[PDB]
């Protein structure tokens, strides 16, 4: 390509058919290249055979995410502001049931807008702003309206840094191809200087402006816009102005104190969102580390070190090419970023970190399943992109004889095991349930697997739960309750509208879901593991790195020779994970409502959204639609003519879109060709078709329009199924 | 390779029959406007003859006539595929034989001809439309009204009326 250059046009390329592999989009017309162009639009086997740029693009086309997450948030802060309900909800929590969005009464619309709290028509929320927002050491609607434009500021600017890259004549190699410092910085002072900084604006301002909110008032009968400077006088109620101490150290006297923190654990009676008196200390006690920690270092050295006998000789030298990969140092990350998201999903529901959550049921489970699909949707990826490594990234083979060349050495092996693992599971991990049916429908309970028939006896208790809620008696200092109230030992009194967390008991019907997870988590990974491992060569095809990591299927021979590849192992690996997460969700809420969520009154006689129906009745896998799907969902199929209605009214579409995927999943290809011409014929008679040769779907595009649909179908189905059984009773 | 038009016979003859019947159509109105008082739909019947019998019906009248119009009309058909109408003043016009510098094909714009004494189907061009579009006009404004023009007392000035229907 010209047009023409090198050097010697500014005149930009708008006009002249094509670009992207060289007997390119050819003069001669076609359609396939219009899904080409969008797909693989980002890729790197083309653009140039030379690293250089690519990192100079990804550090820019990156940017436009932050900026975006930044245009987003703004319409959420704005939204969570003038489309109010926040002002109204906060003087009045336990009571309200929040909104931010509202229609405009065009056509049918309005049904969707149904009285939500501080006196107005709207559609609800299961996205816990209104609750980060508890923070506001200040309060005010127009104020969020500054935090809002403060958002659009970071954006335009944190979006003109993206002009101020690639398009501007760019940095180069050394800049990233000296890695030497990167984490040094990152973790030290941002990971640090945020958490740190967050400390300073987490007791300064917030703690006090909810220390005396957890009582009454109406805001501006509290927390001015400046009030919190030098005036270290209201900081007087929430500890000393250090009195006689000077910059910690010890020649200090406490005859009666010990700074803010004074460590909690449990839950505010009046706002059980976990205590804040702590929340500063923990973030402070973070940062320090990061503050000390981001001070390594300059790199091989540490990895060029510990080897052994069978261990990893190539451990030593574990990648020069880890300054020369991406597709590698992205895949690693996704496993972590991803696997480090759904660890949120627990510490959240068994330890709320915001005021008013749990009581708020629906506004932190939405969460625990949204955060849950990322700690999964980012993991199969975290494999895909390793397959993208394993196939291609490096120039030649300069990488040699090491940890990997090792793992591969065995490979019909690491995956030889893992397999049997799964059929051991599955048999012990699902037909287990099927016993029950076949023998409870035969009907002889003597011999089921009930929490009571097969020998276990009115106790689960003695394991580690019961040595967690009881541990404030070790090296442990203490502080009433535990760490997470859901643990075996002691305490009850949690909240005065509805409930929050309490013990959460186990045994079987907790024993075996917990095991289906195993088998589910395991056969997921089998297919990804073997998939990324056998990326490039095999004894079904060895001539098998020769195009890319996709390729439809090699060809009718060898018997099958179809699925193979690794786009496709990252195609049938999604297919499982949709279950992996989709059944983990199914788990939590049936627990968390069967027990936990429920409610106090006199003598606090607890009354769960369901008197533990779980008991003897999830163990039957029909009980999973006797007690679940057919029981709850009665709220989705009753939901017409209401306010939420948009869920029942989705629940048919998307419970349709899924049942459209199979068409894309289950079908041939020269088929819709053979068909597309009958069409093309009738077209030509009137004189109406040929130009831009209309073509069927690109074997693997077809699979691309399976899967993606099967998910946005099979998923939102419950996104509806859910929001419709926590809004309204529960 | 048949570049463009064409047509011809075609719907130039298409028109003049619109033209000259929109012209007549409005002779319809003509009446009730000078010594005025009598019309609209007036769903005539239509001028009505003697005091010796009809009597609301005596018959579908209306319905018949145009059975007649009917084979007279096959007749003009019975002309335009293959030119046959003595005068010959529509199909191209009279001035016997001629105009058909468009009868055998090859037009593009072709203006035409046809009066011996003298001039043409031309300023019978534009009475041609004045009346087609007039009807357009005429049974445009019913659907709310039915009368024209007095003096400068209080009529021609449009005072207050009532939407379209709605």
């Amino acid at each position: 390509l010209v047009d023409r250059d090198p050097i010697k046009t500014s005149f930009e390329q708008w006009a002249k058919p094509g670009h992207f592999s060289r007997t390119i989009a050819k003069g001669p017309d076609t359609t396939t290249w219009i899904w080409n162009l969008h797909a693989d639009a980002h890729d790197f086997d083309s653009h140039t055979s030379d690293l250089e740029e690519i990192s100079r693009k990804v550090f820019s086309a990156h940017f436009g995410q932050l900026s975006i997450i930044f245009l987003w948030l703004s319409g959420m802060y704005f939204h969570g502001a003038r489309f109010s309900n926040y002002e109204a909800w906060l003087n009045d929590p336990t009571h309200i049931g929040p909104s931010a969005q509202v229609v405009w009464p065009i056509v049918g619309q309005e049904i969707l807008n149904g009285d939500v709290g501080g006196g107005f028509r709207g559609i609800q929320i299961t996205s816990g702003f209104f609750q980060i927002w508890r923070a506001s050491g200040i309060t005010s609607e127009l104020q969020l309206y500054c935090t809002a434009i403060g958002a659009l500021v970071f954006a335009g600017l944190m979006l003109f840094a993206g002009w101020f890259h690639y398009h501007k004549a760019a940095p180069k190699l050394a800049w990233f191809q000296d890695v030497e410092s990167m984490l040094n910085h990152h973790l030290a002072g941002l990971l640090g200087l945020g958490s740190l900084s967050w400390a300073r604006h987490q007791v300064h301002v917030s703690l006090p402006i909810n220390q005396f909110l957890n009582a009454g008032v109406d805001p501006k009968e509290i927390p001015l816009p400046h009030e919190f400077i030098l005036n270290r006088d209201l900081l007087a109620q929430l500890y000393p102005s250090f009195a006689e101490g000077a910059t910690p150290f010890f020649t200090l006297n406490w005859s009666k104190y010990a700074d803010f923190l004074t460590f909690r654990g449990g839950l505010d009676p009046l706002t059980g969102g976990l205590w804040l008196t702590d929340i500063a200390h923990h973030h402070l006690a973070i940062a320090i580390l990061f503050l000390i920690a981001g001070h390594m270092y300059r790199i091989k050295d540490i990895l060029e070190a510990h080897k052994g006998p069978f261990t990893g000789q190539g451990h030593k030298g574990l990648y020069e090419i880890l300054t020369t990969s991406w597709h590698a140092q992205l895949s690693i990350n996704l496993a972590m970023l991803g696997s480090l998201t759904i660890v949120v999903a627990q510490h959240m529901y068994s330890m709320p970190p915001y005021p008013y959550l749990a009581t708020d049921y629906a506004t932190q489970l939405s969460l625990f399943t949204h955060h849950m699909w990322i700690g999964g949707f980012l993991i199969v990826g975290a494999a895909a992109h390793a397959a993208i490594f394993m196939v291609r990234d490096y120039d030649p083979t300069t990488r040699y004889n090491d940890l990997l060349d090792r793992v591969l050495r065995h490979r019909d092996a690491i995956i030889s095991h893992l397999n049997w693992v799964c059929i051991f599971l599955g048999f012990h991990s699902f037909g287990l349930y099927i016993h029950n049916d076949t023998m409870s429908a035969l009907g002889r309970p003597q011999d089921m697997f009930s929490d009571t028939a097969i020998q276990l006896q009115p106790v689960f208790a003695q394991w580690i739960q019961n040595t967690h809620a009881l541990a404030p008696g070790t090296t442990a200092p203490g502080a009433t309750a535990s760490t997470s109230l859901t643990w075996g030992g002691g305490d009850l009194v949690a909240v005065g509208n509805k409930v929050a967390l309490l013990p959460i008991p186990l045994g079987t019907a907790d024993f075996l879901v917990h095991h289906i997870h195993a088998f589910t988590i395991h056969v997921t990974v089998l297919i990804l593991l073997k998939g990324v491992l056998f990326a490039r060569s095999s004894r079904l095809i060895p001539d098998k790195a020769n195009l890319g990591f996709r390729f439809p299927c090699d060809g009718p021979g060898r018997g099958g020779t179809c699925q193979v590849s690794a786009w496709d192992h990252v195609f049938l690996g999604l297919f499982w994970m949709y279950n992996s997460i989709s059944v983990v969700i199914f788990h939590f809420s049936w627990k968390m409502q069967s027990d936990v969520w429920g409610t106090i009154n006199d003598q606090g006689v607890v009354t769960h959204i369901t008197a533990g129906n779980f008991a003897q009745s999830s163990i039957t896998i029909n009980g999973w639609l006797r007690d679940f799907l057919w029981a709850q969902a009665s709220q989705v199929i009753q939901s017409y003519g209401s306010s939420l209605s948009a869920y029942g009214l989705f629940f048919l579409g998307a419970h349709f879109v899924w049942a459209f995927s199979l068409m894309f999943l289950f079908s041939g290809r020269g088929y819709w060709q053979e068909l597309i011409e009958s069409i093309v014929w009738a077209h030509n008679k009137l004189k109406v078709a040929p130009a831009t040769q209309p073509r069927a779907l690109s074997i693997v595009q077809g699979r691309a329009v399976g899967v993606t649909h099967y998910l946005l179908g099979g998923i939102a189905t419950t996104w509806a199924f859910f929001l419709a059984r926590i809004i309204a009773v529960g | 390779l048949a570049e463009d038009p064409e047509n011809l016979r075609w719907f130039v003859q298409a028109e003049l029959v619109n033209g000259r019947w929109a012209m007549l159509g409005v002779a319809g109105m003509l009446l009730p406007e000078v010594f005025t008082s009598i019309g609209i739909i007036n769903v005539p019947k239509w001028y009505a003859a003697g005091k010796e019998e009809y009597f609301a019906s005596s018959s579908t009248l209306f319905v018949i006539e145009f059975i007649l119009s009917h084979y007279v009309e096959i007749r003009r058909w019975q002309d335009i595929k293959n030119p046959g109408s003595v005068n010959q003043d529509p199909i191209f016009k009279q001035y016997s034989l001629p105009a058909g510098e468009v009868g055998y094909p090859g037009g593009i714009f072709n203006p035409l001809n046809f009066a011996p004494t003298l001039e043409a189907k031309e300023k019978e061009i534009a009475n041609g439309r004045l009346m087609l579009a007039f009807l357009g006009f005429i049974i445009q404004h019913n659907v709310t009204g039915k009368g024209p023009f007095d003096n400068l007392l209080q009529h021609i000035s449009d005072p207050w009326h009532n939407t379209i229907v709605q």
Binding site: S10, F11, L142 | P159
Partner: protein, 176 residues
Amino acid sequence: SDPESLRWNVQAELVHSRWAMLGAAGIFIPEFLTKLGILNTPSWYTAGEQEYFTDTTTLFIVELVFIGWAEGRRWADILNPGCVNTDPIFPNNKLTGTDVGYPGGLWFDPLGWGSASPQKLKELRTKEIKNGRLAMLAVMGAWFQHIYTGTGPIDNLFAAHLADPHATIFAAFTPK
């Protein structure tokens, strides 16, 4: 490093300009002309104070039967004859192009020296104040804003309100 955008009709934008803006003359001088206290008063009784209204939307019809007529005739034979088909001379046509209009037809032309040249000298006059008029009216059309926004008491709409000193509108000057 600099845009890709001299709209070739970079040549035509400039002639709704002399349209828009010469035009704002009609508002600029007749306004403040007005005639402060003429002697004085604005009163229009005549066709207007008894014959049941005068205009509004018989207003427009008559009003821009003419603007109708004239604005059309304006750009659509500014010039351009040749007036059809079929290969490129660019503006998005000049498919008039190399032929102005007629090969020895009539007096398509104005003026001797085989063109249209309204002679050579007169860059003077209307380069200056006139694409001025473009500029000028930018800022006393930026006064349209100042001149009235604030909907003189008689209405606060969507009540922020949002502070309060004193009023605003027009007549000339300013407190300061």
